[PDB]
Amino acid sequence: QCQDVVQDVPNVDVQMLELYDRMSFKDIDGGVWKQGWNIKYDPLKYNAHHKLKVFVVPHSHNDPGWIQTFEEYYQHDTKHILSNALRHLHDNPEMKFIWAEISYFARFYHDLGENKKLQMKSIVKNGQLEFVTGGWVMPDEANSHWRNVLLQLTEGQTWLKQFMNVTPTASWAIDPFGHSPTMPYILQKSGFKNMLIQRTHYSVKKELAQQRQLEFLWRQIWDNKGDTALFTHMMPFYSYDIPHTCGPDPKVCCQFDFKRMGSFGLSCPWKVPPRTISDQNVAARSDLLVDQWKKKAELYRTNVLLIPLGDDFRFKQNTEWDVQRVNYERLFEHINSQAHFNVQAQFGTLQEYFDAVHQAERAGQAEFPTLSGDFFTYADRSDNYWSGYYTSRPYHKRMDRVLMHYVRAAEMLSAWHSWDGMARIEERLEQARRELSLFQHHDGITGTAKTHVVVDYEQRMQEALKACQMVMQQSVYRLLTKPSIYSPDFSFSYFTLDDSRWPGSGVEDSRTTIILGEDILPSKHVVMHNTLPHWREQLVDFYVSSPFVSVTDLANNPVEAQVSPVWSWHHDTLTKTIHPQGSTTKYRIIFKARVPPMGLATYVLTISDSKPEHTSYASNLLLRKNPTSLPLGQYPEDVKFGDPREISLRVGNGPTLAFSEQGLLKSIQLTQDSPHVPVHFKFLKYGVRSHGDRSGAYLFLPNGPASPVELGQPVVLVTKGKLESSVSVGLPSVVHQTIMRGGAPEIRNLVDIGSLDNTEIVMRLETHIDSGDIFYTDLNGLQFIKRRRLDKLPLQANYYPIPSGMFIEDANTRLTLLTGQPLGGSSLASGELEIMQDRRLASDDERGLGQGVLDNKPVLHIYRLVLEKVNNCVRPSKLHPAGYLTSAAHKASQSLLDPLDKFIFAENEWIGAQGQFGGDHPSAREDLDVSVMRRLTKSSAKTQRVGYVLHRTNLMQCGTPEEHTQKLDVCHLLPNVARCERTTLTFLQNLEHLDGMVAPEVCPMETAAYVSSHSS
Ligand SMILES: *[C@H]1O[C@H](CO)[C@@H](O)[C@H](O)[C@H]1NC(C)=O
Ligand SMILES: CO[C@@H]1[C@@H](N)[C@@H](O)[C@@H](O)[C@H]1O
Ligand SMILES: [Zn+2]
C-alpha cells in the first residue's frame, strides 16, 4: 500500500542534484538581464484570439524583526501600511493587495475598532485583500525544523480561520535565502495547491528559464508516484523589487516604480527616473512596459503573466498608494484599449494568477514539468553564496531547538486534562507558540538581524521557555497526585525543570542543587517525562549537595547510580591556561530513568551518612604538566594527575574510544573483536578576505581552506565511571567534551569565540571512509538529501545547512553526526565531515544589515557521533537522491532533540505522589513519532477535541529483526472517544471520518494529523 521510499528512483524532468552535476555555473554578463540573456519574442505570438493576461499583484514585504524589532516596525511602518491598505482598498474597489505575515496582521486587527474590523473582513471576503501562506511569519527554510515550520503555519492559519474565515491555499515565499522541499511537503498536506519562491541561485534561474521550467510540480525526492507534488512558481530575476519584477531590464522596470520620483527619498540607480503617466506619454510608456512583460512571458508556458508590484515595507503613505494606483490605472486603460498589444492587464491577487494558469493548463495550453530536489546553497551574484547564515548567531539557533522541544512537551503534558481558565494554560501556551513561531522568521533563526533585534528574540524566547515550564510543572503535579488530594495553586511552582544542556555548563549557572542533609531534608522526589511514544531509558543527572545519595523508584526498588564531580572550566588569566575546577559543595548524581511512552516516572534521591550500596563514584584524571591539587570536599575518590598521554575508554559493552594526548578522538572500536577505525576530531579556523567581498551574517567568503587551530598543550580531564565516562579538553575557544554512556558518544562543545575577529571556527572529522564527493545532510529535520561536492564551485557553495544531521558512507562504513542545533557544514574531501561552530565577523556583507557579527556569546553545542557498519543495509540505488538513517542514528537524533524532561519537586513533601503515568500507553514502532499532541478546545466545550500530528520516518533495513511493538491509535489515547477524523496538518479541515474511531498509522516518510472528539 505504502510507497517504497528506498528502492524506486523517481522519474522527474528536473532532479536538482543531476542538474547541478551538468550545469557549468558560468557567471557571464547577459546584458540588461545581467544573469540571463537578451530575451526575444515573436510579436505575433499574441493576437485577438490569444491575449496575454497580466496580473499586477501589489505587495509589501514586512519583516517581523530585522533592522528594527517587531514592535518598532509595527509602530513605525506596518500599522500605517495596514491602516492605509484598509482605507485605500475600501475606497478603490478594483485595487488589490496580498499579505503574508500574520504576526503583524493579528497585532493590527486586534487593535482596530469594531467598525474597521468589519471593513477589514469585507475587503477580505470580497477578494481585494488576500492572505498568502498565512503563517505567523515567512520562515527561514534552511535552519528551521519542520515541526516549527508547521507550528508557525498553524498559528497564523488558525488565527485567519477564526477571525477572517479564510484559509490560504497559495504560498508566497519571496525572501528566504534559498528554498527547501520541506515547504511543499508541509503545504500540500495542509490544503495548499500552489506556491511561489524567489531566492534561488542565479544560474538555476537561467537554466530553468531557458527550458521554461520555472513553473513545475515539485515533489519529494523519494516520491515515485507524485502524490506529494505541489505546483510551484519560481520568479526569474534577481529580486522581487519593482525593478526586477516587470521584465528583464531593471533600468526600464525602475521607471514603473512610481515611488521613485524624489519626494519619497527614493531614486533609480540606473539613472532614469519614473515619470507620471499622462495622455501625452502613455502610448510610449505602454510600449516600453508591454515589451518588458512580453519578454518576461517568454520564460513561462501559459498566456497568464505574474507581475508582483512591491518591495520592503511598501504601501505605507497614502500618497504612495495613490501614485502607484493612479499611474497603473492609466497604463491599464491605454493598454487594454489598444488591440495591437493583445494584452489584458489588471490588478490581481496571487490566487487569481494561479487560478488563471491552471485554467490555461486545463485548456491544453501547457503541461508542466516535474521536479525534485532543493534550492540550496543560494547565491544572488558572483561567488556570494549565502552559507554564512547556516551558522550566524548559533546561541539562538540552539535555543530554537530547546524551545521547540519545550513547546511540544508543554502542549503534550497539558493536553491530557481540560483546564480551568484560571490556570492560564491556553494563555501561556499561546505565548510560547507565538514567540517560537516569530523566531522562525527569515531574520530570526538565521542570525541575520541587528544586535538589539536578536536580543528581542532572545527575551521573547526566554519568556516562552518560562511559560512552557509553568505549564509542564502544573501538568506533572496534576498527573501524579492522587485526585482527591490534588489542590492546585495555579501560580505556584510545584516543580522546577532541570536541564543539563541548556543554557549549559559554562554558559549559565542556572540549575538548582538538590539540597539534602540530616538536619534539613533527607530526600527529594524527581520526575522524568518522555514525550516520545515508546518506552525509553536515558541517563539523567541532577546536582546534589552530598556525594552520599542513593536512588530508588517509587516502589522503593534501588536504582544503580553514579556520582561524579561538578567540573567547570576557567580561562585562568593569571596562569594563561584553561583548566577545570571541581566543586567541593555540589556533585552530579547520574542514573538510568525508564519512562513510559508519552509518560512520567518518579524517583527518589535519599542522602545517607556514607557511600550507599547502589551508588558508585567516578575516578578523575587531570592530564597536564605542572598540575596543582584539586580537592573535591566529601567526594570519596581523590583526583589523579599525569602528563598528557593517549587514553582509551569503554563504557558498558559499548564502543572503545581512543583519544590523542590533546583529548581529541582518534579512533572508534565498535566491538572487542573489531578494528580501531580512524575517526579524528580536529578544530580549524577560516578567515576573511583582505580584498574583495567580506563575509558577514549572510555570506561565507573564506580566504581559502581552513587552518588548524594551534592547540598548545591543552589540559585534558578524564572522568571514568561505571555509567558514564568522559574526556574534556580546554582548547582555544572551545571546551570539547566526548561523553560515553555505552552507545554512540555524545559530543559537547562549549564555544566561546571571545574576541577573535574575522574568524569562523569549524569542527572537522577525518576518516578512512571512501565517500569520494558524496555526503548527506538533512532538510529541516525531516529528510536526508544526497549532496555532491563540486570542485567547479567555490568552497562556500559546498556548504549546506545541517539542521539536524549529516553523514558520509562507503560500501561498508558510515559516520553520522547528529546535531542539537542547526549549523553549516560540508564534506570538503573524501572521508571528512565538518560543521561550523561559530563565526565572528567584523564587516557588513552589503545586504542591508549594516553590521558585522560581533555579539557572540558562549554556546553549548551538542551532538551524537555514530560510526556503523552498513554493508548489510538495504540502501537506495546509486541514482536515488535520498538517504536514510539507521535506527541507532535516528534514536541518537531523538536523544538530542527530545530528551527526557526532568522535574525536581520544590517543597519538602509531596502528599499523594504517584510513581508513574502512562504505563498503559502503547509503545509505538521506533520509526513513528507523535510530533504534536495539542488539545484544541477550552474547558467550556461540550465536545473536547485533541489534535495529533503523526510522523513516520524511514529507517534502513540492516538485518536487525523487527520486534513486537504496539499499534498506536491516537484516537483512543483519551477516553470516551466519540469521533476520529483525519485532518490537514494545521487541524483546520476535516479530510476523513474514521471508521471505528481508529486513526491508522502512517506510511514511511508520511505525516498525518488526526483529531479525536470526546464527550465531556
Ligand atoms: C465564511 O466562509 C464560508 C466558506 O468557507 C461561508 O460559507 C460562510 O458563510 C462564512 N462563515 C463564517 C462567517 O463563519
Ligand atoms: C536579504 O535581504 C532581506 C531583506 N529583503 C529584508 O526583508 C530582510 O529579510 C533581509 O534579510
Ligand atoms: Zn525579509
Residue nearest to ligand 2 atom 2, measured at CA:
847
What does the alpha-carbon distance between residue 280 and residue 219 come to, in Å, rounded to a whole number? 50
**Single-letter residue type at 613:** E
Residue nearest to ligand 2 atom 3, measured at CA:
175
Atom index in ligand 2 nearest the CA of residue 61 equals 7
Distance 67 CA to ligand 2 centre (A): 9
Ligand 2 binding pocket mutation candidate from 312, 386, 439, 699 (most atoms within 8 A of CB): 312
Crossing angle for the helix pair 146-164 and 425-439, nearest 10 degrees?
Answer: 120
What does the alpha-carbon distance between residue 395 and residue 507 come to, in Å, rounded to a whole number? 10
Residue 462's SS3 state is helix
Give me the active site residues, please.
175
Q: Which residue bears the cell 520555472?
A: 214
Residue nearest to ligand 2 atom 11, measured at CA:
443
For 599-661, the three-class secondary structure string (H helix, E strand, C coil) is EEEEEEEEECCCCCCCEEECEEEEECCCCCCCCCCCCCCCCEEECCCCEEEECCCCCEEEECC
CA distances from 412 to 106, 488, 972 (A): 26, 19, 15
**Helix ranges (DSSP H) in 383-486:** 394-415, 425-439, 451-479
Is residue 223 in contact with ligand 2, taking CB distance under 6 Å? no
Strands (E), 252-405: 304-312, 343-347, 370-372, 379-381, 384-385
**Single-letter residue type at 444:** G
Which domains are present in the chain? 1-382 (3.20.110.10), 383-493 (1.20.1270.50), 494-618+899-920 (2.60.40.1180), 619-898 (2.70.98.30), 921-1016 (2.60.40.1360)
- Listing from the earlier edge strand, what are the strands of the sheet with 577-595? 513-514, 536-544, 577-595, 561-572, 615-617
Half-sphere exposure of 856 (CA within 13 A, CB side): 28
Distance 118 CA to ligand 1 centre (A): 15
Is residue 66 in contact with ligand 2, taking CB distance under 6 Å? yes
CA distances from 206 to 15, 209, 246, 716, 787 (A): 16, 5, 17, 53, 21
Count the Cβ atoms, other than its own, within 10 Å of residue 1003. Answer: 15
Half-sphere exposure of 560 (CA within 13 A, CB side): 8
**C-beta separation of 602 from 554 below 8 A:** yes
Is residue 63 in contact with ligand 2, taking CB distance under 6 Å? yes
| Residues ≥6 apart with Cβ < 8 Å to 5 | 222, 223, 882, 884, 954, 1004, 1005
What does the alpha-carbon distance between residue 770 and residue 815 come to, in Å, rounded to a whole number? 11
Distance 163 CA to ligand 1 centre (A): 11
Count the Cβ atoms, other than its own, within 10 Å of residue 633. Answer: 14
What does the alpha-carbon distance between residue 249 and residue 43 come to, in Å, rounded to a whole number? 18
**Single-letter residue type at 245:** T
H/E element holding 422? none
What does the alpha-carbon distance between residue 754 and residue 771 come to, in Å, rounded to a whole number? 35
Count, in order, helices (H) and strands (E) of the chain.
16, 51
Distance 96 CA to ligand 1 centre (A): 21
Atom index in ligand 2 nearest the CA of residue 446 equals 11
What does the alpha-carbon distance between residue 893 and residue 806 come to, in Å, rounded to a whole number? 11
* Nearest partner of 465 among 489, 433, 440, 441, judged by Cα: 433
**C-beta separation of 822 from 397 below 8 A:** yes
Sign of CA dihedral 60, 63, 67, 71: positive
For residue 161, which ligand has an atom nearest its CA? 1
Which cell numbers hold the place of 609?
A: 551518612
Is residue 442 in contact with ligand 2, taking CB distance under 6 Å? yes
Which cell numbers hold the place of 1002?
A: 502512517
Is residue 443 in contact with ligand 2, taking CB distance under 6 Å? yes
What does the alpha-carbon distance between residue 25 and residue 16 come to, in Å, rounded to a whole number? 13
Which cell numbers hold the place of 614?
A: 547502589
Residue 517: DSSP 8-state = B
To one decimal, the resolution in angstroms is 1.4
Is residue 312 in contact with ligand 2, taking CB distance under 6 Å? yes
Distance 438 CA to ligand 1 centre (A): 28
Atom index in ligand 2 nearest the CA of residue 177 equals 1
Count the Cβ atoms, other than its own, within 10 Å of residue 940. Answer: 8
Query: Residue 716's beta-bridge partner residues?
Result: 623, 729
Residue 662: DSSP 8-state = T
Distance 175 CA to ligand 2 centre (A): 6
What does the alpha-carbon distance between residue 280 and residue 278 come to, in Å, rounded to a whole number? 5
Q: Which residues are annotated as a binding site for Zn(2+)?
A: 61, 63, 175, 442
| Residues ≥6 apart with Cβ < 8 Å to 163 | 106, 109, 121
Q: Which residues are annotated as a binding site?
A: 61, 63, 175, 442
For residue 698, which ligand has an atom nearest its CA? 2
Atom index in ligand 2 nearest the CA of residue 698 equals 1
Is residue 67 in contact with ligand 2, taking CB distance under 6 Å? no
| Residues ≥6 apart with Cβ < 8 Å to 188 | 228, 229, 230
Is residue 101 in contact with ligand 2, taking CB distance under 6 Å? no
DSSP secondary structure string for all residues of 253-277: HGGG-TT-SSTTS---TTS------
